[PDB]
Amino acid sequence: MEALKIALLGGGTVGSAFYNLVLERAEELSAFGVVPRFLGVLVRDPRKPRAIPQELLRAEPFDLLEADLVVEAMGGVEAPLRLVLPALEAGIPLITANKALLAEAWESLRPFAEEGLIYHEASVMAGTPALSFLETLRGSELLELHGILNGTTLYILQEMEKGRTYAEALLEAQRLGYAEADPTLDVEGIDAAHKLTLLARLLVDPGFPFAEVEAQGIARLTPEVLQKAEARGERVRLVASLFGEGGRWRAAVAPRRLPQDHPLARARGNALWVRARPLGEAFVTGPGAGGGATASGLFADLLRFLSGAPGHLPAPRARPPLEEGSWPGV
Amino acid sequence: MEALKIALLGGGTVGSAFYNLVLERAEELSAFGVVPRFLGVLVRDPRAIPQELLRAEPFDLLEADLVVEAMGGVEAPLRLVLPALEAGIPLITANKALLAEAWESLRPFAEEGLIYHEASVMAGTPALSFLETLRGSELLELHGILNGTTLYILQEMEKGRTYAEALLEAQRLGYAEADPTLDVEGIDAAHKLTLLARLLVDPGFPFAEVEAQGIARLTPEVLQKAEARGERVRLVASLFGEGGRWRAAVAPRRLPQDHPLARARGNALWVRARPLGEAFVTGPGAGGGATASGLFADLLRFLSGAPGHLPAPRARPPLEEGS
Ligand SMILES: N[C@@H](CCO)C(=O)O
Ligand SMILES: N[C@@H](CCO)C(=O)O
Numbered sequence: 042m043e044a045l046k047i048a049l050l051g052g053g054t055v056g057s058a059f060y061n062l063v064l065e066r067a068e069e070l071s072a073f074g075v076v077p078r079f080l081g082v083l084v085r086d087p088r089k090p091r092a093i094p095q096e097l098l099r100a101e102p103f104d105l106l107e108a109d110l111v112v113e114a115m116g117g118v119e120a121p122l123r124l125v126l127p128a129l130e131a132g133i134p135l136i137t138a139n140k141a142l143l144a145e146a147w148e149s150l151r152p153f154a155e156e157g158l159i160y161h162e163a164s165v166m167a168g169t170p171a172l173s174f175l176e177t178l179r180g181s182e183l184l185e186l187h188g189i190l191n192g193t194t195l196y197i198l199q200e201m202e203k204g205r206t207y208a209e210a211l212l213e214a215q216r217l218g219y220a221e222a223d224p225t226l227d228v229e230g231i232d233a234a235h236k237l238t239l240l241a242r243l244l245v246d247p248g249f250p251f252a253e254v255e256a257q258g259i260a261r262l263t264p265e266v267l268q269k270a271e272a273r274g275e276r277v278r279l280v281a282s283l284f285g286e287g288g289r290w291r292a293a294v295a296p297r298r299l300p301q302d303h304p305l306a307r308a309r310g311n312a313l314w315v316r317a318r319p320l321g322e323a324f325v326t327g328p329g330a331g332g333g334a335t336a337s338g339l340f341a342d343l344l345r346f347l348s349g350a351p352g353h354l355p356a357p358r359a360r361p362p363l364e365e366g367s368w369p370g371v
Numbered sequence: 372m373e374a375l376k377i378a379l380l381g382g383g384t385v386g387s388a389f390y391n392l393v394l395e396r397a398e399e400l401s402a403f404g405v406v407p408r409f410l411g412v413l414v415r416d417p418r419a420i421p422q423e424l425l426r427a428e429p430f431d432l433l434e435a436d437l438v439v440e441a442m443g444g445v446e447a448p449l450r451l452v453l454p455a456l457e458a459g460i461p462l463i464t465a466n467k468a469l470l471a472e473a474w475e476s477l478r479p480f481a482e483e484g485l486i487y488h489e490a491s492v493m494a495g496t497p498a499l500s501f502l503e504t505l506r507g508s509e510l511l512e513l514h515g516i517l518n519g520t521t522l523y524i525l526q527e528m529e530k531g532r533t534y535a536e537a538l539l540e541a542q543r544l545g546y547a548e549a550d551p552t553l554d555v556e557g558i559d560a561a562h563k564l565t566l567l568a569r570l571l572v573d574p575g576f577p578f579a580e581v582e583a584q585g586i587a588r589l590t591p592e593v594l595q596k597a598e599a600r601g602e603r604v605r606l607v608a609s610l611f612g613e614g615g616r617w618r619a620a621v622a623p624r625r626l627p628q629d630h631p632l633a634r635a636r637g638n639a640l641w642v643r644a645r646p647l648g649e650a651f652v653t654g655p656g657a658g659g660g661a662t663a664s665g666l667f668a669d670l671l672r673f674l675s676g677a678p679g680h681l682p683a684p685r686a687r688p689p690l691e692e693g694s
């Protein structure tokens with residue numbers, strides 16, 4: 042019964058949900074010969090009430106190099122980057138839900154992702170299978186991908202359909218723990234753009250640049266626009282699309298007018314829809330935000346690791362699209 | 372650059388789609404530093420594979436890097452694959468009957484990461500990888516539509532087609548097992564359910580504990596009565612706790628018409644789990660190209676250095692006495 046030494050960066054909603062899920066499932070972990078021990082938990086304010094023992098809280102960065110895993114849920118990009126690099130350089134894996142970090146700091150992190158050191162299932166659609174879904178879809182050649190990747194904005198549109206205001210729905214989504222610390226990221230399409238980038242890199246181009254995604258959000262939408270779409274037989278959603286234009290992959294995020302019977306329109310959670318050759322049309326859906334939903338993703342990766350599987354790899358080379366693709370905007 | 376020496380067992384619709392997919396996608400493989408080299412294709416009936424590669428009799432597998440099996444049956448493929456597994460050679464298979472019935476012999480190799488079998492449930496639609504990620508949570512209930520032939524038949528009988536006429540149409544389309552009994556009496560669903568249970572909740576789950584029935588009581592009139600009640604009938608494979616133990620069943624179920632499982636056009640797996648919540652995957656569960664996508668996914672999984680599909684490390688406790 043060896044120690045599994047975990048350094049946890051972040052003690053907010055996700056880090057806490059993680060810490061507690063680990064404790065609750067500690068029995069399950071003995072089935073691999075380990076007992077989880079947290080070396081420490083990086084938090085901003087050690088005085089806040091928190092379901093993590095005081096004795097483990099760290100206000101300043103702590104040495105990571107004795108850890109077996111670093112789990113990162115601390116927010117931002119540059120700071121987590123500088124903290125995880127020394128661990129990665131030492132061959133310590135990282136488990137993360139940090140889609141901005143992966144999207145924006147890929148020059149530094151790609152070499153370690155290539156070595157199977159980075160697990161990030163929870164960085165897209167939380168614990169809903171998304172990266173594992175695309176790992177399987179590698180069996181085919183991608184024709185087109187369209188996803189509703191951002192939970193906060195799905196929630197807002199679902200509530201506006203029911204007549205609720207933008208502002209009301211937003212505030213609710215922040216209370217549910219769906220929104221980013223900057224909710225602009227959610228509502229302007231940027232969070233969906235981060236996630237789209239990561240899907241592109243896994244599936245078709247390991248160097249795909251975040252800056253190439255063309256993103257717009259939901260700031261022009263209102264209950265009246267969604268009610269006019271309901272009368273046309275349509276639902277408006279924020280959709281992240283990857284498709285071929287002139288022999289190159291084009292990535293875009295934008296509101297789209299969907300037929301109301303489409304899988305993407307009827308999904309209650311977040312959703313990822315793929316057409317690929319020769320499989321055909323496949324889709325996955327589930328909760329794409331929240332503390333528990335995200336911790337399920339991080340824990341799934343912890344189990345992937347402990348089972349002996351490596352992390353999520355980028356696509357082994359870039360390849361061009363098989364066909365010219367094209368949903369209608371609002 | 373290394374040669375990947377592949378022994379393919381089966382030259383039917385699946386074997387053939389797989390052979391052609393591997394050669395068509397040989398550039399994809401060279402991005403892992405390999406070149407695919409088939410040793411031979413074992414064939415039952417002496418298709419879209421060169422005649423010179425066909426083998427009417429079994430061939431030594433021990434110099435293979437990988438064995439791929441899409442032969443069907445149990446004991447014949449088992450005896451052909453076991454010497455390879457004993458030598459540490461991995462197996463990629465779509466053969467759900469084999470895994471469900473010969474688990475006493477196959478489990479120890481599955482536990483060492485030598486068996487890849489995504490294609491064995493819902494073909495190349497993610498099902499085993501979906502549950503691998505769901506292990507982050509604990510299962511409360513699982514329900515799937517795991518057989519394509521019976522989904523086709525029910526869908527056609529909704530439209531007023533008779534059982535026999537839909538089954539023949541399913542047979543032309545290539546969905547049905549060679550004996551359609553395995554489809555229509557729920558057995559094929561019950562093989563697949565067993566495999567899902569062993570991955571997620573109990574690595575010793577016996578195929579014999581699955582309580583399976585098929586679609587033989589169903590007709591166009593029954594499905595129309597269900598439609599008038601706002602329901603669809605489907606053949607559903609369920610996994611749920613009852614008095615402290617996991618139970619597995621296959622049977623026709625009256626579903627709400629707007630349920631994800633009722634609205635799915637292909638196979639579907641629907642789960643509630645703690646703390647994730649409700650998740651769902653759907654896509655084609657049958658067919659040559661669909662199956663071949665699964666087997667090739669597994670090949671790429673293997674070549675990237677990831678092990679095969681592991682059983683659950685230990686039986687898990689049910690959280691809910693459901694139904
Ligand atoms: N703000 C994100 C959180 C989960 O990544 C969302 O709404 O999807
Ligand atoms: N006969 C099976 C093939 C897929 O394994 C079906 O109908 O689902």
Ligand code: NA
Pocket residue numbers: 162163164165166167168169170171172338
């Ligand atoms: Na995910």
Ligand code: NA
Pocket residue numbers: 489490491492493494495496497498499665
């Ligand atoms: Na599958």
